[PDB]
Amino acid sequence: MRLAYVKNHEIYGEKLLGLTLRERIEKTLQRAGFDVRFFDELSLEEAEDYLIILEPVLILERDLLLEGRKILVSDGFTVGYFFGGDFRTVFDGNLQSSIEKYLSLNNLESYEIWAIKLSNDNLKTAEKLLLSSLIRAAFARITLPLARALLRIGLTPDAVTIIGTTASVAGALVLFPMGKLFPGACVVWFFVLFDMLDGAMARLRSGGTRFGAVLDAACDRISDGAVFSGLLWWIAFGMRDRLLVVATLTCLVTSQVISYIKARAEASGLRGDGGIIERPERLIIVLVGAGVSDFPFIAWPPALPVAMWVLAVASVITLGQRLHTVWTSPGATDRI
Amino acid sequence: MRLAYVKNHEIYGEKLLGLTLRERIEKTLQRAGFDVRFFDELSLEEAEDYLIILEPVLILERDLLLEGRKILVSDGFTVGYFFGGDFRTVFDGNLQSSIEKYLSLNNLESYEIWAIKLSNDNLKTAEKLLLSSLIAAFARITLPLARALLRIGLTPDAVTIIGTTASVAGALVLFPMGKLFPGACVVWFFVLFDMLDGAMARLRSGGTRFGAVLDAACDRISDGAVFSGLLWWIAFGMRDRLLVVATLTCLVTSQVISYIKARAEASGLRGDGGIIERPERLIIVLVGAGVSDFPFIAWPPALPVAMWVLAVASVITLGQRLHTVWTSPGATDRIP
Ligand SMILES: CCCCCCCC/C=C/CCCCCCCC(=O)OC[C@H](O)CO
Ligand SMILES: Nc1ccn([C@@H]2O[C@H](COP(=O)(O)O)[C@@H](O)[C@H]2O)c(=O)n1
Ligand SMILES: O=P([O-])([O-])O[C@H]1[C@@H](O)[C@H](O)[C@@H](O)[C@H](O)[C@@H]1O
Ligand code: NA
Ligand code: NA
Ligand code: NA
Ligand code: NA
């Protein structure tokens, strides 16, 4: 029983891509389980949650998971508030004063919602953004507080890159050779996410650098190499499995070369992206295989070879596919 | 609207250094701003200038600066005629008589062009002269090799892939068996074989960007295969684990060293340099393995010193290139 009180605006009457923004916001809010009430003077009906939207907005995210007590924002503009039913016990009639009292009386967090504030002179951007949205949100909502905190405590994006890469190589090269595949997989995954935090951090500094991007990518390569090298050490000298080291060497080399194809193609002004296995799928397959092979109490060892062999084949295919991208890029076959 | 009318000849179908003489003269004339039309009986379309080439000819000049009314010649042989559009008002159907009437009606000048008229019994001399126009031990052994490989229908990319495949096969067949000296010899030979592809591309009046990307990716696959075969032998043949950490370092760091330069150039920065580059890498490792397995005088310590040196030299290199990326223009500028 959640109520969504939306303040009326003349711009809601405007139609965007065949539907009125008033209908568009009504449908998005309803999809999120809200009973929608457009209002001019706020009349609070008894409910468990109150989503109060005061500024005209077009919500671009399909799944709106609202919880706690939050302040909804987008691109720095405060769009609305997510209060509890206890707000009814404070609301006296003046919405500004009631909101200020509720904010002073409670602990609230900001909630970045994928949305844009509407005006008479910005509907082209709203149409473009709705089309982009129709053709991640929670990823941003969990990433931005983390990046904010890391910046506040004095860490720079490149520093976080180095820390995540160093910690991931340390976990891979200490835990994997010892046979501790499950804790190694967990530590490596944690610090791979940590390394990926630098992009959000740089976006919060009004922009990153080209060196920072090159460093992030080279560190990705060092981290992948370390994962596969620790796994290779274990498989070769711990399990004493020669076929599986053939698969591991293939995975190592082809992952390096798969990333290198895209880098070098872009260096030549061509494209080289795509493929079945990219770095996220690569890491997931190999780390899940290792973890399942060493899972506590109910370990299934054949998960390690399977993941390794599958990946290997999927890497070889990928290496070809990316080459095809390079082949099909404009200007790739010019005699220049 | 300049039209070049070239009389069709059977000889134009022959290939000289990978390209047909038809395509070669077509590209040469198009570079000079002509739309090329091959003909048997002349049917004059309205145009600004007319370049009529009746005898089968190989044009050896890159830049053709044609203006006014000229008669193209070489060594006394009449190569072509450069008339104005007014020739359209004189052409009566018989091309020889029309050409003679147009010459009688105008004052023309000779234009000495570097070209050779083709016949069935002078294509060897024509190929030699084309090679001179397009172009150490490289001249006497590499260029004949490229001419030969092109003659039998092989393309530059074909030689790239074949040389890389042969080198990978040598590395992965000979090295794991402990045949380090024969492996070093085979790998060195087929590295040179792969490097023949550049001469082949230069002889086809230009390579491609895809060809360059492929050459680089194949270099990476070759490095990976060399170090993987050596790692296999060292791990299961010599059973030397310290040397396997050194070899793993060499493998990974060679891949990442190349990736750094590629990625920096993708970002518009520089990333080259370092003490140990791919030629020095190959020389050190291939010489160390060969000396360790040399017949009569095999000296085992050459493989570990070459590897450890290499390892230490690679890590440093990886740092140096990163510093290059840091110090390139615009590397640390903020991207709004
Ligand atoms: C797409 C290109 C990928 C390129 C990278 C692929 C990496 C593959 C690694 C192969 C290891 C070689 C295995 C060779 C089998 C060795 C057989 C043998 O004779 O082993 C004897 C042993 O060393 C003493 O007991
Ligand atoms: N497959 C191909 C096609 C063209 N090329 C050309 O040859 C150049 C390098 O020559 P080498 O292979 O002899 O080093 C490349 O940068 C490119 O211009 C090539 O190396 N391989
Ligand atoms: O941005 P970047 O790191 O240069 O490019 C990388 C990513 O685009 C992709 O997600 C990853 O899976 C590939 O390995 C690729 O190399
Ligand atoms: Na990063
Ligand atoms: Na940076
Ligand atoms: Na990274
Ligand atoms: Na090559």
- The length of chain B, given as a count of residues: 336
Elucidated via: X-ray
Q: Are A312 and A252 in contact (CB under 8 A)?
A: no
Q: How many CA atoms lie within 13 A of A295 on its CB side?
A: 12
Virtual torsion, Cα A285, A287, A293, A295, nearest 10 deg: -120
CA gyration radius, chain B = 28
Q: Would you tell me how many other CB atoms lie within 10 Å of the CB of residue A306?
A: 16
CA-nearest residue to A323 within chain B is B214
Which CATH number does B2-130 carry? 3.90.550.30
Classify the C-alpha dihedral A197-A202-A203-A209 as positive or negative: negative
Check if B219 is active-site.
yes
Contacts of A86 (CB under 8 A, 6+ apart): none
**DSSP category for residue A76:** T
Between the CA of A274 and the centroid of ligand 3 the distance, in Å, is 9
Alpha-carbon torsion angle B106, B66, B6, B20, nearest 10: 160
Q: How far apart are CA B99 and CA A62, in angstroms?
A: 76
Please, are residues B115 and B78 in contact by the beta-carbon 8 Å criterion?
A: no
DSSP strand pairing (B70-74 vs B109-112): parallel
Q: Is B219 in the pocket of ligand 2 (CB under 6 A)?
A: no
- Ligand closest to the CA atom of residue B264: 3
Among residues B49, B219, B223, B293, the one annotated as catalytic is B219
| Resolution reading in Å | 2.1
Backbone phi, psi, residue A51, to 5°: -100, 105
Q: A63 and A137 in contact (C-beta within 8 Å)?
A: yes
User: Is B131-327 in CATH node 3.40.50.11260?
Assistant: no
Q: Which residue has the tokens 């006296």?
A: A92
Yes or no: say if A66 and A51 are a contact pair by the CB < 8 Å rule.
yes
Looking from the CA of residue B196, the nearest atom of ligand 2 is 13
Domain segments of chain A: what residues? 2-142, 143-328
CATH fold of A2-142: Spore Coat Polysaccharide Biosynthesis Protein SpsA; Chain A (3.90.550)
> Smallest Cα–Cα separation from A268: which of B211, B324, B159?
B211
Taking an 8 Å cut-off on Cβ atoms, the answer to whether A225 and B258 are in contact is: no
Q: What is the dihedral of CA B180, B182, B188, B191, to 10 degrees?
A: -100
Report the C-alpha gap between B320 and B257 in whole angstroms.
10
- The two domains A2-142 and A143-328 share their CATH topology (first three levels equal): no
Say if CB B102 and CB B69 are below 8 A apart. no
Tokens 């003490």 -> residue: B275
β-bridge mates for residue A81, sequence order = A52, A71
Report which of A95, A217, A91, A88 is spatially closest to residue A161, judged by C-alpha positions: A217
B262: left (phi over 0), alpha (psi -120 to 50) or beta: alpha
The encoded tokens of residue B279 equal: 């030629």
Residue of B nearest to A204 (CA): B336
Per DSSP, what are the bridge partners of residue B57?
A: B117
Structure tokens at A45: 């009906």
| Ligand number, closest to the Cα atom of B190 | 7
CATH for the stretch A143-328: 1.20.120.1760
Please answer whether residues B223 and B250 qualify as being in contact, where contact means their C-beta atoms are separated by less than 8 angstroms.
no
Q: Is B272 assigned a ligand-binding role in the annotation?
A: no
**What is the strand order of the sheet B70-74 is part of?**
B35-39, B2-7, B49-53, B77-84, B70-74, B109-112
